[PDB]
């Protein structure tokens, strides 16, 4: 059954990432014994939650959730209301409020839409956060699309010197639909994950969350540019290489260029 | 406890919609998942039939020296498929890679003879579009109507590279004098799975009206329609996405902010907005 | 008509020219058209009123300098025609355009309309017997004597990392930016105004290029240089007045690695180099890492190659042998390769003849290049 989990993860890596929720539910139907293993291991699109007391949307993960209920980052309360939920420390809660506010301004500048959520769970040696974002594209347009963040960070605070070992694990779950130009409609689904670790000295001017943020900004600019290329580097060579009309006239030229390069090869040496 | 009938339906959805580079692996993944073989092996055999028809993939029959695509138009109905070029029936085994034990077929083929001249032409143009290209031009009567059904594909699979590009083309040409009617769908699929996944999924539905004149003309007219459509398609598929995806993917999330300055974290944590 | 062919290596900053089968380009001069600002009162003044090359360099202060070509894309076509006419004229080459075949160069992945209009100029206005446009990276490898390897380059207009493996220039793996020496010179000019010493004039713009060429260095750790206070070194201008440069000298060439500082989204030189290696096939990546060739003027900063090596070590997979090689004459690397390519007997087959252009048109030029 360890091979079954390996196959289950291999299957979700090959099926469309647009239908993770439906396929994961069916995969749990087919293997009910792996339900707990698959829900933890298989990454899926983030759920929308609504805080009724504040009147604001928050996002749901395994880390912020304790049992059936999920701590809202705005009110600090779980829905449904649990008696003794796993809350953070009063210092970490104040830090968590400042994280939410900081990453609220983060998202709103990069996307200018959507919803985010930030939750920080208390550790003895550190403070570890999750930064969720979900932005939806223009619904009226034929081109649908969304962008989803799952930045999990682990900060190991050192005792002396005020330095902090950060460990960022960032997933980016994308699905671009393209229905335009009167030539057909294409739907592209991406899912790259990148890891980054760093030790930064703590400043009194800028808190530790700002140090975390700097990793997110740099990671997102790089992951995005990496993603961007893995799209083209494959959608270009593979599709063009299959059905290129200019392949057959250039093939005759390449064969001429093969004689030419061979003549160049001898002449370059001497 | 999930019922045995529920297990087969879950297996069917994955096998019916699996990426063709790894679909035979997906079947192996479904089989390596559920313990017993017979329940999936029996259910997959039906799925493979429907699945291998929608791929337009050719099984090489041992002694033909060419590749005959398989579809709904070649389906005789008795688990054997037509090869309209070489004009022999073949039984296609769906688990195993090969199709063997063929049977010579003989039909009057009056509608079928006309299109086989147009077919042998199409091939030469398929060879022009792709480095490796295989086809099948089915000849059939559909509820009294007279219809050529050319199909083209391309399979480019490599295990080490982790990328797989696959083309399938569906083309139906109904013969009616003078004016004829055409219906065709054109699907691309590419999949990259290194350090995480990326998929290209596509199609173009085209409705066209052609007029029959000569055998040389009808052979070179339909091909011309395909040539221009598939180029315009690839052109748009390559040239729009390299630029427009970059801008639409950017319209969702921008590479830098509206200021074009990396956001200052010190600014965020000690500034107030509004009124 | 197979005379000794001419190699006009184009470029936004500098334009090289000369004959085939030569060691160095004899005719190098900056690519711009100087025109007189002031009113010519006195008789017996500078005649012509359109200055190109060494006359324009000699008489900077009179002339309002303007560049015809930005980011490997000509804006003013009349200016480039005058430059090409000056190249062929008696003041530089001492030849006719009708005699010799032409080898042109351009940056990769440019607009095709500019390539067509370039060919129109060579075939119609000049009466060229045969034309051939080529890549810069392909030539630079022919100059060195290798076939395999990536070519990172940095001129005044374009920075592009082209991977090649045994005479197979992958058109798809070519990365490119519109960020280069001109943008670094513009960013240094902006920093000098923040320091105090403002330069706004077009003749005065070339003093900023001269300061950028001479007094600049790329630090390995930029955060460490930001925390430390600079020494504020001096430099004498063409006039005589001294200028304390300050922290502008080291923060100016950071634009190439951090493109966010000017205010435009791009990858960067070090990212582009990693990105060109990644887009190619898995088996060819380790050979591409081992052979990395440098070229252009904006690779000549102090500690540039050392910073590139550190950036590759950070991004690339671990336990891989990195080697960023470079020639002695980095400025004339592309032209030497063209002179070698032109001297070869194969060159006759590749070119676009004037008869072939008159028959077909632009389509034949698009086919022969790729």
Short mmCIF file of N, CA, C and O in Angstrom, two decimals, chain C residues 217 219 221-232 246-247 250-251:
data_model
loop_
_atom_site.label_atom_id
_atom_site.label_comp_id
_atom_site.label_asym_id
_atom_site.label_seq_id
_atom_site.Cartn_x
_atom_site.Cartn_y
_atom_site.Cartn_z
N UNK C 217 32.54 49.46 -11.46
CA UNK C 217 32.88 48.10 -11.03
C UNK C 217 31.66 47.40 -10.43
O UNK C 217 30.88 48.02 -9.70
N UNK C 219 30.20 44.86 -7.86
CA UNK C 219 30.47 44.19 -6.59
C UNK C 219 29.85 42.79 -6.58
O UNK C 219 28.84 42.55 -7.23
N UNK C 221 28.90 41.02 -3.62
CA UNK C 221 27.79 41.16 -2.68
C UNK C 221 27.26 42.61 -2.69
O UNK C 221 27.94 43.51 -2.18
N UNK C 222 26.07 42.84 -3.29
CA UNK C 222 25.52 44.21 -3.33
C UNK C 222 25.00 44.71 -1.98
O UNK C 222 25.07 45.92 -1.71
N UNK C 223 24.46 43.81 -1.15
CA UNK C 223 23.99 44.16 0.20
C UNK C 223 25.13 44.63 1.11
O UNK C 223 24.93 45.51 1.95
N UNK C 224 26.31 44.03 0.95
CA UNK C 224 27.50 44.41 1.73
C UNK C 224 28.03 45.79 1.32
O UNK C 224 28.44 46.57 2.18
N UNK C 225 28.03 46.07 0.02
CA UNK C 225 28.41 47.40 -0.50
C UNK C 225 27.40 48.50 -0.14
O UNK C 225 27.78 49.67 -0.02
N UNK C 226 26.13 48.13 0.01
CA UNK C 226 25.08 49.08 0.41
C UNK C 226 25.23 49.50 1.88
O UNK C 226 25.07 50.67 2.21
N UNK C 227 25.54 48.53 2.74
CA UNK C 227 25.78 48.79 4.17
C UNK C 227 27.02 49.65 4.41
O UNK C 227 26.99 50.58 5.23
N UNK C 228 28.11 49.34 3.71
CA UNK C 228 29.35 50.12 3.79
C UNK C 228 29.22 51.47 3.09
O UNK C 228 28.42 51.62 2.16
N UNK C 229 30.01 52.45 3.54
CA UNK C 229 30.08 53.77 2.93
C UNK C 229 31.20 53.79 1.89
O UNK C 229 32.30 53.31 2.16
N UNK C 230 30.92 54.36 0.72
CA UNK C 230 31.89 54.41 -0.39
C UNK C 230 33.03 55.40 -0.15
O UNK C 230 32.96 56.25 0.74
N UNK C 231 34.07 55.28 -0.97
CA UNK C 231 35.27 56.14 -0.89
C UNK C 231 35.12 57.47 -1.63
O UNK C 231 35.80 58.44 -1.29
N UNK C 232 34.25 57.50 -2.65
CA UNK C 232 34.03 58.68 -3.50
C UNK C 232 35.27 59.05 -4.32
O UNK C 232 35.96 60.04 -4.04
N UNK C 246 31.10 58.81 -6.35
CA UNK C 246 30.37 58.32 -5.18
C UNK C 246 29.80 56.92 -5.38
O UNK C 246 30.43 56.09 -6.04
N UNK C 247 28.62 56.63 -4.80
CA UNK C 247 28.02 55.29 -4.93
C UNK C 247 27.34 54.99 -6.28
O UNK C 247 26.93 53.85 -6.50
N UNK C 250 28.98 51.96 -8.77
CA UNK C 250 28.75 50.53 -8.53
C UNK C 250 27.27 50.13 -8.61
O UNK C 250 26.96 49.00 -9.01
N UNK C 251 26.36 51.04 -8.25
CA UNK C 251 24.92 50.81 -8.37
C UNK C 251 24.38 50.93 -9.81
O UNK C 251 23.28 50.45 -10.09
#
